[PDB]
């Protein structure tokens, strides 16, 4: 997966490998995610770190220009669930 | 696609997905792109926003270090034609 | 493949196609790796431009979170072997 610092895929840009349990650990990526593109598989995502306090919204392949639309605000961490 | 702000792949990076309306909106890609990198798919690029004046060269899969070289200076927008 | 300032996969990043004869000529990554993600091919990862000097280790696809486990400092270029 991709995550984008703003929308419609722009910003600065920070690349997800099956999992992340710290997105906001990146000092290249100071921000937080606007737009997201998963490239395989389905993802679950966090509003905390370590996996915790999911948000409901899952996400397969595809383009997601405005996560805000989805109620996405803070993504603490990630992960591939298939 | 992948553009880069120096040639031969080299500089700050931008990854487009199916196409950008907009390239010049993106604040974090502050410069004219002078290569690329198609992985997938033949691309149309556009002087302006919003798929509008083409570049007459289409790209496929490929490396291409110096985009001047096809007269391309500046990249308003792009996408995927196939 | 894919070079990152940081353990982890975190910091600034650098893709690689194919290969790289001199890692150290982009202004844009301003550090010496520390992880790295191969995507696809079997890399061979050199201490000197123009792929002199090469690191013993080979790196297939996988996540390398910290190269210098490998006894990996400096990559000057690098290239796949397959
Ligand atoms: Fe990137």
Not at 27 to 48: C, H, K
Not at 53 to 61: H, L, Q, R, V
């Amino acid at each position: 997966a991709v995550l984008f610092a703003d929308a419609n895929q722009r910003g600065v840009h920070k690349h997800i490998f099956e999992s992340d349990a710290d997105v906001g650990a990146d000092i290249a990526f100071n921000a937080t995610p606007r737009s997201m593109v998963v490239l395989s598989g389905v993802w679950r995502l966090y509003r905390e770190p370590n996996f915790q306090s999911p948000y409901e919204a899952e996400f397969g392949p595809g383009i997601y220009p405005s996560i805000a639309d989805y109620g996405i605000n803070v993504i603490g961490s990630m992960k591939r669930i298939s």
